[PDB]
Design an enzyme around this catalytic site. Structure first.
Site, PDB file in Angstrom:
ATOM      1  N   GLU A 131       1.232  -1.026   0.389  1.00 55.44           N
ATOM      2  CA  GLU A 131       0.132   0.169   0.335  1.00 55.44           C
ATOM      3  C   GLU A 131       1.038   1.308   0.021  1.00 55.44           C
ATOM      4  O   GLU A 131       0.343   2.230  -0.561  1.00 55.44           O
ATOM      5  CB  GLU A 131      -0.790   0.029   1.499  1.00 55.44           C
ATOM      6  CG  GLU A 131      -2.131   1.532   1.436  1.00 55.44           C
ATOM      7  CD  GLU A 131      -2.459   1.213   2.739  1.00 55.44           C
ATOM      8  OE1 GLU A 131      -1.893   1.265   3.733  1.00 55.44           O
ATOM      9  OE2 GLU A 131      -3.878   1.843   2.625  1.00 55.44           O
ATOM     10  N   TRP A 170      -8.272  -2.369  -0.421  1.00 53.01           N
ATOM     11  CA  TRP A 170      -8.848  -1.121  -0.351  1.00 53.01           C
ATOM     12  C   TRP A 170     -10.175  -1.504  -1.584  1.00 53.01           C
ATOM     13  O   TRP A 170     -11.004  -0.499  -2.464  1.00 53.01           O
ATOM     14  CB  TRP A 170      -8.103  -0.405  -1.696  1.00 53.01           C
ATOM     15  CG  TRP A 170      -7.406   0.360  -0.984  1.00 53.01           C
ATOM     16  CD1 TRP A 170      -6.327   0.782  -0.194  1.00 53.01           C
ATOM     17  CD2 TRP A 170      -7.922   1.608  -0.398  1.00 53.01           C
ATOM     18  NE1 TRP A 170      -5.514   1.494   0.227  1.00 53.01           N
ATOM     19  CE2 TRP A 170      -6.886   2.540   0.288  1.00 53.01           C
ATOM     20  CE3 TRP A 170      -8.715   2.048  -0.523  1.00 53.01           C
ATOM     21  CZ2 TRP A 170      -7.329   3.263   1.552  1.00 53.01           C
ATOM     22  CZ3 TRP A 170      -8.673   3.814   0.118  1.00 53.01           C
ATOM     23  CH2 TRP A 170      -8.034   4.103   1.118  1.00 53.01           C
ATOM     24  N   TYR A 220      -5.531   9.291  -1.467  1.00 58.88           N
ATOM     25  CA  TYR A 220      -3.803   9.357  -1.203  1.00 58.88           C
ATOM     26  C   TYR A 220      -2.415   9.901  -2.207  1.00 58.88           C
ATOM     27  O   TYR A 220      -2.276  10.543  -2.334  1.00 58.88           O
ATOM     28  CB  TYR A 220      -3.496   8.443   0.063  1.00 58.88           C
ATOM     29  CG  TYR A 220      -4.276   8.115   1.418  1.00 58.88           C
ATOM     30  CD1 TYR A 220      -3.585   9.249   2.361  1.00 58.88           C
ATOM     31  CD2 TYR A 220      -4.962   7.418   1.291  1.00 58.88           C
ATOM     32  CE1 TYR A 220      -4.725   8.698   3.684  1.00 58.88           C
ATOM     33  CE2 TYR A 220      -5.918   6.812   2.209  1.00 58.88           C
ATOM     34  CZ  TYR A 220      -5.895   8.238   3.320  1.00 58.88           C
ATOM     35  OH  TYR A 220      -6.690   7.956   4.951  1.00 58.88           O
ATOM     36  N   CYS A 278      -7.857   9.813   6.007  1.00 61.83           N
ATOM     37  CA  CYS A 278      -8.357   9.639   7.476  1.00 61.83           C
ATOM     38  C   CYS A 278      -6.855   9.728   7.915  1.00 61.83           C
ATOM     39  O   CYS A 278      -6.663  10.637   8.709  1.00 61.83           O
ATOM     40  CB  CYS A 278      -8.145   8.666   7.693  1.00 61.83           C
ATOM     41  SG  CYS A 278      -9.930   7.562   8.505  1.00 61.83           S
ATOM     42  N   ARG A 301      -7.003  12.573  11.637  1.00 63.75           N
ATOM     43  CA  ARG A 301      -8.518  12.088  11.734  1.00 63.75           C
ATOM     44  C   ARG A 301      -9.401  12.116  12.780  1.00 63.75           C
ATOM     45  O   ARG A 301     -10.116  12.158  12.996  1.00 63.75           O
ATOM     46  CB  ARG A 301      -9.991  13.768  10.917  1.00 63.75           C
ATOM     47  CG  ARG A 301      -9.708  12.631   9.910  1.00 63.75           C
ATOM     48  CD  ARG A 301     -10.867  12.557   8.852  1.00 63.75           C
ATOM     49  NE  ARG A 301     -11.186  11.651   8.104  1.00 63.75           N
ATOM     50  CZ  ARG A 301     -11.951  11.006   7.417  1.00 63.75           C
ATOM     51  NH1 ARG A 301     -12.602  11.101   8.859  1.00 63.75           N
ATOM     52  NH2 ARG A 301     -12.321  10.192   6.906  1.00 63.75           N
ATOM     53  N   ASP A 319     -10.204   4.009  14.520  1.00 59.11           N
ATOM     54  CA  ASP A 319     -10.381   2.982  15.041  1.00 59.11           C
ATOM     55  C   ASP A 319      -9.320   2.011  15.353  1.00 59.11           C
ATOM     56  O   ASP A 319      -8.143   1.762  14.750  1.00 59.11           O
ATOM     57  CB  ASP A 319     -10.629   1.988  13.894  1.00 59.11           C
ATOM     58  CG  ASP A 319     -11.213   0.426  13.931  1.00 59.11           C
ATOM     59  OD1 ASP A 319     -11.255   0.245  15.287  1.00 59.11           O
ATOM     60  OD2 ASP A 319     -12.627  -0.239  13.411  1.00 59.11           O
TER      61      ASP A 319
HETATM   62  O1  LIG Z   1      -6.342   4.449   7.369  1.00 56.01           O
HETATM   63  C1  LIG Z   1      -6.940   4.248   8.156  1.00 56.01           C
HETATM   64  C2  LIG Z   1      -8.626   4.522   7.661  1.00 56.01           C
HETATM   65  C3  LIG Z   1     -10.078   4.871   8.479  1.00 56.01           C
HETATM   66  N1  LIG Z   1      -9.604   4.237   9.384  1.00 56.01           N
HETATM   67  C4  LIG Z   1     -10.943   4.005  10.360  1.00 56.01           C
HETATM   68  C5  LIG Z   1     -11.428   5.579  11.356  1.00 56.01           C
HETATM   69  C6  LIG Z   1     -12.968   5.637  11.269  1.00 56.01           C
HETATM   70  O2  LIG Z   1     -13.763   4.164  11.982  1.00 56.01           O
HETATM   71  C7  LIG Z   1     -13.669   4.730   9.497  1.00 56.01           C
HETATM   72  C8  LIG Z   1     -13.404   6.814   8.675  1.00 56.01           C
HETATM   73  O3  LIG Z   1     -15.089   7.042   9.333  1.00 56.01           O
HETATM   74  P1  LIG Z   1     -14.972   8.228   8.718  1.00 56.01           P
HETATM   75  O4  LIG Z   1     -14.007   8.427   9.520  1.00 56.01           O
HETATM   76  O5  LIG Z   1     -14.529   8.603   7.734  1.00 56.01           O
HETATM   77  O6  LIG Z   1     -15.872   8.655   8.553  1.00 56.01           O
HETATM   78  O7  LIG Z   1     -11.664   4.566   9.350  1.00 56.01           O
HETATM   79  C9  LIG Z   1      -8.580   4.174  10.838  1.00 56.01           C
HETATM   80  O8  LIG Z   1      -8.724   4.415  11.537  1.00 56.01           O
HETATM   81  N2  LIG Z   1      -7.488   3.842   9.954  1.00 56.01           N
END
Ligand SMILES: O=c1ccn([C@H]2C[C@H](O)[C@@H](COP(=O)(O)O)O2)c(=O)[nH]1
Ligand SMILES: O=c1ccn([C@H]2C[C@H](O)[C@@H](COP(=O)(O)O)O2)c(=O)[nH]1
Lengths: 264, 264
Positions: free
Chosen positions: B58, B80, B94, B146, B166, B169
Site C-alpha cells: 500500500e 482497498w 492519498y 484519515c 482525524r 479505529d
Molecule cells: O486509515 C485508516 C482509515 C480509516 N480508519 C477508520 C476510522 C474510522 O473508524 C473509519 C472512517 O470513518 P470516517 O471516519 O470517515 O467517517 O475508518 C482508520 O482508522 N484508519
C-alpha cells in the site's frame, strides 16, 4: 496557566539547540499536546498581561475572508504590518483559505459555512475540518500558515476543537494562538446551540528563542491566577456578524506584561 | 505495544458513546498523542499478529501516485476493494495528493519530492509538510483521508515525523497506520542520510466500535513482546525505487491474530 508554564519548563529542560531562518537559535521540542476544558474558564495567560483587543479584531478579520490589512488599520491593529506589502496585501493567507479556498475548476470553498452546516446537521461527523494549508497557494502567501489545520468534535452537547500548529514560539506566539481559537470555539458553539467542551492544542516544532531566556525565567517564577470568564453580550444572526463590542472578558487580573524583543 | 494498550484502556475507561455513519455505536475520545522512539525498535503491535505485506505494498502504491487498485491486485492485496468502483478507481485519494496535488493554475505538486528537497537542503525548516487534505477534491474521493496531514522534523541528525489522524479505529486501523508511517520515516531517513528519530501519532476522533468489546478485552489481557527490528536490504537511487523485497522484519514474535468483524 498551569499547562502553559509546564510547556515552558519542558522546552527549557528538554529542548535541543536548533537554528531558525533568521539565524537566532532556539531551544526546540517536536510534538506536544495540551487540553483546556473551556468550562473551567477562558484560557488567557495570567502570568503576563495579554491584550485581547488585537486577537479579537484579527479573528473577525479572518472570518471576513479579508487578507488586506485595511480593516486592521481602521482599528489601529498593527500586528500584520510586518508582513504586508505597500498596498497592505498579505497574499492568500488564513481568511482567504477559510472563506474562499480556490479549486482547480473555478469554485471558492467556504470552509467556515461548511463546518457550521455539519455541526448543525451531522454533528457525529469525523470530518468537520478547516485547513489553511493550501499547497497550491503557499508561494503567494506572505507566510506559510502556522496554525494550519483544525478539527471540530461534538459529544454530549459539547463542542470541542483540536488545532494543529506546525510551528510555535511559546513565549510570543502561543498565548495569542490559544485565546484566538478558544474564542472561535465559543462563537461556533453559540451559533450551533452547543455547550463548550475542550480546546486541544497540538504542536509541531515548539520552541523558545535563545534571546528570551531571562523573560522565560521571569515568567516561570510567577504564580497563575484564576482564569477569566468570557461573556458574549448578544447572539448575532450568523458567525459573520459578530462585532468587537460583543465580547467582554471578566475577572482578568494578570501579572505585568513582559517585553520580548526579536532579531531582524 | 505499551503505548497502544494504554490507549485501548483509555478509550474503554474514558470514551463517550457516539454513533458512527453506519449506525454502529463507538466509544470515543477526542485528542490523543503517542510517541515512538524508532531507535527502540519497529512499532509493530505484538499483542496480535499484524501482516506487514499489505502495509508495504500500500505504501509503495501511494508513493507511485497511483489511485487505481490494479497494482494492488497484481500482488493480491485487497484492502482497498471495498472502496473501488468497477474500473478499480478510488478517485483522487492519498497517492494523487502526495505526488500530484492539482493547483488552480494547471500545475501538479509533488509534495514527496518537495519534502526530500527540504530535508536535504533546509533541514531546520518548520514547514516540511505533506497534506492529503485537498478541500477542492474531497467530493471526488472514495473517502476522505484519515491520515490527513504529516510533518517532518530534523534535530541532531535524527528524522522525526508527526502524523495527524482525524479519525481512528483503535482496533482495526491504528496498528496498520503506525507501521505504515514508521516505515516511511525509515525510507525518508535512508534517502537523506539521517538517523531515525521519533514517530509522533496525534489523533482526532479516536475510537473502538461497540461490537469489538470482547476482542479488546482479549487483547488487553496479553503481554507486549519485544519490538522487532526493520532491516532495509539495499539503498535505492530514490524514494520511488523501493521494492517489496527490500524490506525484512526481524524478531517479530506476535500473539495470535484476533478477528474483528464489521457491520455493513
Ligand atoms: O486509515 C485508516 C482509515 C480509516 N480508519 C477508520 C476510522 C474510522 O473508524 C473509519 C472512517 O470513518 P470516517 O471516519 O470517515 O467517517 O475508518 C482508520 O482508522 N484508519
Ligand atoms: O501564529 C503564529 C505565527 C507564527 N508563530 C511563530 C512560530 C515561529 O517562531 C515563527 C514562524 O516561523 P516559521 O515558522 O515559519 O518559519 O512564528 C507562532 O508561534 N504563532
Amino acid at each position: 496557566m498551569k499547562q502553559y508554564l509546564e510547556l515552558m519548563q519542558k522546552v527549557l529542560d528538554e529542548g535541543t539547540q536548533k537554528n531558525d531562518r533568521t539565524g537566532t537559535g532556539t531551544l526546540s521540542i517536536f510534538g506536544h499536546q495540551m487540553r483546556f476544558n473551556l468550562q473551567d474558564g477562558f484560557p488567557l495567560v495570567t502570568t503576563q498581561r495579554c491584550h485581547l483587543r488585537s486577537i479579537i479584531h484579527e479573528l473577525l478579520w479572518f472570518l471576513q475572508g479579508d487578507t488586506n490589512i485595511a480593516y486592521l488599520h481602521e482599528n489601529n491593529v498593527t500586528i500584520w504590518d510586518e508582513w504586508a506589502d505597500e498596498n497592505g496585501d498579505l497574499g492568500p493567507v488564513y481568511g482567504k483559505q477559510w472563506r474562499a479556498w480556490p479549486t482547480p475548476d473555478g469554485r471558492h470553498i467556504d470552509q467556515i459555512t461548511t463546518v457550521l452546516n455539519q455541526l448543525k446537521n451531522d454533528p457525529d461527523s469525523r470530518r468537520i475540518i478547516v485547513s489553511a494549508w493550501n499547497v497550491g497557494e503557499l508561494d503567494k502567501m506572505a507566510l506559510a500558515p502556522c496554525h494550519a489545520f483544525f478539527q471540530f468534535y461534538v459529544a454530549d452537547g459539547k463542542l470541542s476543537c483540536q488545532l494543529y500548529q506546525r510551528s510555535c514560539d511559546v513565549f510570543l506566539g502561543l498565548p495569542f494562538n490559544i485565546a484566538s481559537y478558544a474564542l472561535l470555539v465559543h462563537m461556533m458553539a453559540q451559533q450551533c446551540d452547543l455547550e463548550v467542551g475542550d480546546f486541544v492544542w497540538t504542536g509541531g516544532d515548539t520552541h523558545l528563542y535563545s534571546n528570551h531566556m531571562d523573560q522565560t525565567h521571569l515568567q516561570l517564577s510567577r504564580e497563575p491566577r484564576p482564569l477569566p470568564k468570557l461573556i458574549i453580550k448578544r447572539k448575532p444572526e450568523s458567525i459573520f456578524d459578530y462585532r468587537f463590542e460583543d465580547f467582554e472578558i471578566e475577572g482578568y487580573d494578570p501579572h505585568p506584561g513582559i517585553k520580548a524583543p526579536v532579531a531582524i
